[PDB]
Design a protein around this ligand. Structure first.
Ligand code: CU
Ligand code: NA
Ligand code: NA
Length: 5
């Protein structure tokens, strides 16, 4: 939530 691939 605080970190997309
Ligand atoms: Cu993330
Ligand atoms: Na982190
Ligand atoms: Na990517």
């Amino acid at each position: 939530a605080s970190x997309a691939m």
